[PDB]
Amino acid sequence: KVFGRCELAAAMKRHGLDNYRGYSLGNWVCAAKFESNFNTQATNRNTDGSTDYGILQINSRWWCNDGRTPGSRNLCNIPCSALLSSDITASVNCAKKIVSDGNGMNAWVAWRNRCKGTDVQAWIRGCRL
Numbered sequence: 801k802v803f804g805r806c807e808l809a810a811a812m813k814r815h816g817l818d819n820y821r822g823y824s825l826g827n828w829v830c831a832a833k834f835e836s837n838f839n840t841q842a843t844n845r846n847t848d849g850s851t852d853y854g855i856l857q858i859n860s861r862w863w864c865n866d867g868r869t870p871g872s873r874n875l876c877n878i879p880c881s882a883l884l885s886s887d888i889t890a891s892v893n894c895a896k897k898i899v900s901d902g903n904g905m906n907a908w909v910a911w912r913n914r915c916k917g918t919d920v921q922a923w924i925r926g927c928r929l
């Protein structure tokens with residue numbers, strides 16, 4: 801599913817991401833826009849052999865199991881395919897674990913380089929939330 805901006809903002813809000821560990825909802829929407837262009841089915845392979853999955857481009861080296869990333873941990877305890885669902889619950893639940901891990905949202909390269917320090921409130925402007 802390719803979300804609209806407000807539709808995803810509302811979904812993320814309902815799943816408890818607004819101000820989760822201090823990150824306002826616009827942060828999460830911004831990260832999703834630049835990680836996946838709001839497409840739950842997005843995959844991208846990395847040089848190390850790992851792959852990033854879903855709306856928040858969660859990596860198979862640490863967080864999910866895709867059966868092809870040797871020595872990977874599966875800290876979210878989920879197949880990586882679960883992260884590509886139109887239902888963002890698994891992505892959200894895993895993202896909460898990631899952002900809790902010590903580096904906050906800096907875990908997401910697109911957030912650090914394209915969202916961090918910008919007016920992220922813009923990403924939820926106009927939405928009914």
Ligand code: NA
Pocket residue numbers: 860861862863864865866869871872873874
């Ligand atoms: Na893994």
